Amino acid sequence: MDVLYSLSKTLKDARDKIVEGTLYSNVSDLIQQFNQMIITMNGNEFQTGGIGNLPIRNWNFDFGLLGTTLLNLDANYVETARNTIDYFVDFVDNVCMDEMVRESQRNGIAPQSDSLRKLSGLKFKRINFDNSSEYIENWNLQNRRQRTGFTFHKPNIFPYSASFTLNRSQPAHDNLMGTMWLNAGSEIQVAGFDYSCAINAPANTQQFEHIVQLRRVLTTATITLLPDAERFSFPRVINSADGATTWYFNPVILRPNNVEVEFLLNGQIINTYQARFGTIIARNFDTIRLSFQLMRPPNMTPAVAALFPNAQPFEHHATVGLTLRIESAVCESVLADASETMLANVTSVRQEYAIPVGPVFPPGMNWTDLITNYSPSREDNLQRVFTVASIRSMLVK
Amino acid sequence: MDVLYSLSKTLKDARDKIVEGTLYSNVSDLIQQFNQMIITMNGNEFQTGGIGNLPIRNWNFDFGLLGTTLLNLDANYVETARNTIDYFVDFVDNVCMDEMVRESQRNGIAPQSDSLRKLSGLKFKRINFDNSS
Amino acid sequence: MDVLYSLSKTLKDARDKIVEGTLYSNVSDLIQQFNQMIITMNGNEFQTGGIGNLPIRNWNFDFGLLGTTLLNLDANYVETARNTIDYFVDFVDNVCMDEMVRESQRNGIAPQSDSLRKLSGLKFKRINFDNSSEYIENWNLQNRRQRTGFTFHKPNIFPYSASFTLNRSQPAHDNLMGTMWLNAGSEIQVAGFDYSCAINAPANTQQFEHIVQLRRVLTTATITLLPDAERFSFPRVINSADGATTWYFNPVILRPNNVEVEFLLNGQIINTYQARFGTIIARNFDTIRLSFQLMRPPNMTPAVAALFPNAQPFEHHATVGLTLRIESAVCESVLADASETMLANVTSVRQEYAIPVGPVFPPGMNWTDLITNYSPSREDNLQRVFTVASIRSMLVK
Amino acid sequence: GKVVDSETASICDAIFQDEETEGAVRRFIAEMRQRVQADRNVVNYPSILHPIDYAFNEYFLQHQLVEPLNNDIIFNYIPERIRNDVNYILNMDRNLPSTARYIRPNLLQDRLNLHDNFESLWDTITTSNYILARSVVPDLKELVSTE
Amino acid sequence: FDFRNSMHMLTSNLTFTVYSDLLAFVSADTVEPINAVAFDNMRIMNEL
Numbered sequence A, C: 001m002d003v004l005y006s007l008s009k010t011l012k013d014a015r016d017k018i019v020e021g022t023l024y025s026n027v028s029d030l031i032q033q034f035n036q037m038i039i040t041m042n043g044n045e046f047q048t049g050g051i052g053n054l055p056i057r058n059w060n061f062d063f064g065l066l067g068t069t070l071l072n073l074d075a076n077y078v079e080t081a082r083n084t085i086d087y088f089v090d091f092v093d094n095v096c097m098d099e100m101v102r103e104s105q106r107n108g109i110a111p112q113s114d115s116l117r118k119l120s121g122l123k124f125k126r127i128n129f130d131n132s133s134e135y136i137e138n139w140n141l142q143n144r145r146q147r148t149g150f151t152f153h154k155p156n157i158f159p160y161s162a163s164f165t166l167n168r169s170q171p172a173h174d175n176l177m178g179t180m181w182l183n184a185g186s187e188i189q190v191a192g193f194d195y196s197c198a199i200n201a202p203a204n205t206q207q208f209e210h211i212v213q214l215r216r217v218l219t220t221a222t223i224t225l226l227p228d229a230e231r232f233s234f235p236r237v238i239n240s241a242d243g244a245t246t247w248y249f250n251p252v253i254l255r256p257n258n259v260e261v262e263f264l265l266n267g268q269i270i271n272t273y274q275a276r277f278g279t280i281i282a283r284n285f286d287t288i289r290l291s292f293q294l295m296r297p298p299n300m301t302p303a304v305a306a307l308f309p310n311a312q313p314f315e316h317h318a319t320v321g322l323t324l325r326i327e328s329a330v331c332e333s334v335l336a337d338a339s340e341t342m343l344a345n346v347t348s349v350r351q352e353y354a355i356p357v358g359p360v361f362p363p364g365m366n367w368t369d370l371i372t373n374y375s376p377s378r379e380d381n382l383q384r385v386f387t388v389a390s391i392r393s394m395l396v397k
Numbered sequence B: 001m002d003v004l005y006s007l008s009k010t011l012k013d014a015r016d017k018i019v020e021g022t023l024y025s026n027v028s029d030l031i032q033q034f035n036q037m038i039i040t041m042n043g044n045e046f047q048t049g050g051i052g053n054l055p056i057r058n059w060n061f062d063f064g065l066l067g068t069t070l071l072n073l074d075a076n077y078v079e080t081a082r083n084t085i086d087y088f089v090d091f092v093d094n095v096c097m098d099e100m101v102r103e104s105q106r107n108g109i110a111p112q113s114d115s116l117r118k119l120s121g122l123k124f125k126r127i128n129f130d131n132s133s
Numbered sequence D: 001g002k003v004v005d006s007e008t009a010s011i012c013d014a015i016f017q018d019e020e021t022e023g024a025v026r027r028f029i030a031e032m033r034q035r036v037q038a039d040r041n042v043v044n045y046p047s048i049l050h051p052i053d054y055a056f057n058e059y060f061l062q063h064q065l066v067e068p069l070n071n072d073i074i075f076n077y078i079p080e081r082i083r084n085d086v087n088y089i090l091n092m093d094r095n096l097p098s099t100a101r102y103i104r105p106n107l108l109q110d111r112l113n114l115h116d117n118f119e120s121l122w123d124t125i126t127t128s129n130y131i132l133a134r135s136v137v138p139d140l141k142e143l144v145s146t147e
Numbered sequence E: 001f002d003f004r005n006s007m008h009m010l011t012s013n014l015t016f017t018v019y020s021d022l023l024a025f026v027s028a029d030t031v032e033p034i035n036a037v038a039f040d041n042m043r044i045m046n047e048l
């Protein structure tokens, strides 16, 4: 594995620092490393493919070296080199892809392909170098084991969930009380509604609460919290809980009262914010709890009073809400987010080559399904597969 | 300050470019820089923490250099190194944190901690490098 | 065979006694043994698989000895070793598994696989050592016509059997007398019922008896015997013997009278216990006989008298019972028990690789079927297969 | 047991006897033998130096400026031309043991540009390179009788 | 002085044979002068 990495920063820090011009000196420490490789290789036959629509190109090795008898690289030097790199490029591609599909329950955290199982071999370790690519940096630290970690802009921690819970309902659905929400990606929107506008509620206040349990702990999260749930601020016709009929939601929005957001870790409050909208920090949590209330306005102008009668029919439905977005955070486990192409790379290679569904990943690498049942096996396979995708993107995008 | 920086790219470009195998010459320019540090250090005691729930861990120095001999690094080389880095890691953490809280109305732009006020010292500037962050 | 064993205690007492640190002469007597192996090997080629979903892997040998030096083992020494062990590990696994499936009638006790048939070869015997692993200790002694068994637990000697026998019945099933039981694993529960509460029985006592014949003799058994059969102390609706209808059982429990447990061997009473509940020892037996009686209470308070009228309908059914559990015992034949993973290992490897049903073992290695018809062939194959599973578990769990 | 060099030797025999040196020492010194693999050309000999000494001698080993040698390389130390100049015959006769070893000629070009100021010295070079030349330029033959 | 920290193991090769001058191994004759040819290939010195 670590092997694999080098093979690339080798080529990038190569196809990049080797051009018509420069002084040798820039590459002395480089050229060397390079050659070392060629040697170890030459003579070993490699096989890739043998699944779905994946060609089976075979590769032989018999390549010359790189004279160090020069100062300024003459064009002629480049071309006689690029021609030798373009075999490694078109190679690695066919290598990544091959181990970017196979899955294993028992040892999923390990290598699979007849291509890689041979790389972890000892006689090859003679290469490894310059491990500063965020992902490998983290692969290693995970095998000796310690405080690993990554960076994500608008991460993808919430499996898609869009539903409601009626705490008070009746067949006609003309006087409901409950909450409706949308948890997806890095965002949560939740609204609490009370058709009666807390007319018969103690202190004329109806309490609401929304709890979201993350499948992985997020640390160092920068979060935007805003009052109101725009998504649930418009008229809707919704299916009843049993699917037998449809109800009408005609919201009128009031400010959420006594807003309290708690970021908990193992049941303990790590961060708590009372009615603080804007940017807040949640430093370590596996659960978010949003509590908010609808308080019947004690003073109402005629126009307002008219919306909230003492008796049914209740035609304007009092609604309070919150919107929470995790802009950035760190997670000890790999996740999809709004900037990295890893998930898309893995999913794309599998789709393009018609790779059959395996025993670990959900059909189509479906994110919601994956994060909903993010087992240790899925995570180890995901990390292996994401790390390979990142190695590949250093050369092929 | 700039001091502080180095101490890291030192370790990263370190805990990263040093793996069982690599042909030496990818680090010759690196090993050197490293050692230089160790020297300047050894012999000077340090103090951190001293507020809220921030432990008051104390530190000392006295470490062997790094055989620049070998041509290809053997596993044994790594471990005898990682063990020396893990003291600098667990150190720097306790260092950053210490000056990541103190504040000053007047010159609230300069160093504060008894840890850093000693770093800006002159005998230390023998380290700075690779400021691309 | 014995060969196989060594290959492991070799590795365990290896992957264990060899670590960054230890002084020199704590491995001298060990290192040696090791090398000896390598030699014998290198050159000989091996093959595994070719049955069901079993990967047909090919193996080769050609590994250097050692640097039988350095005092306090330097890290570098380890790694250059672990890399050579991990080929033997991943090997042996593929070896055990291969001979952990093949069945043979006539003479099934012996080796089968193209992998092992070559191991029993003579040029290989240069390896055997440290046979303190309970199982091998017993394998050998068995090839030497001699006695000795294994220590088991909450053993699995009783094939599942849950039934009843009506000694007095009639179409309406309103005045039955008989017994019902559950024999399973290491436990027996049996109840004797008499709807008439021995109203017309001699001495107002109804005798009951339950006999269980073990398929193998158990020696040195520690047994818990308790009055009452909780399993048969509640109301039931049961199918009639002919399956044509259902009867009602409405038990009321009385203490079993004149309890006598006999542990017999070849028809002879070896141990007998009269009304002794708690912990008892049965030192050697192939049969258990439980005799107990229901004695109509000679004196009854009104509430009791009301349950037992002189004439039908009999609505409360007098029931007496016993519970017997074999906590531990020794058997000269391998058996499944509540602690060892052998049966589960063999069954699991066969299931995972979709191994076809063979001529010896019942489909799915079904324990009840196996112990019910525990033929010599099944036992020899089971022992071979259990011994291999135990060799495998020294390295792979 | 066979060991590294003289000093290495001495030391052992020496300590072996300073009674107050852990029974482990004798042991190690004892049973510890050389490493002799015929095939391959491996030789791992037990040694003893010092941190700063190992330091030295070490690199001396890891920088044995000695590349291999195939008929092919001999053939190659030859100008791409000439070989392709029929007029000249080439052929091999001696064999090559997988023992062959040479020392790189190190022919990095000019490095120093003297051809743009150090006239004084160029003149001395040219001169030189020139005489050199005459020494080679084959003499002529079959002329037309002067007279 | 601490022993174990001074004792090292040695990676040394085994039995080379160093060669200098080189060339020599080059067996080479030459056509007869009357048969010369330049990159031309027609013949150098062709005025019989």
Ligand SMILES: [Zn+2]
Pocket (backbone or CB within 6 Å): C154
């Ligand atoms: Zn138990």
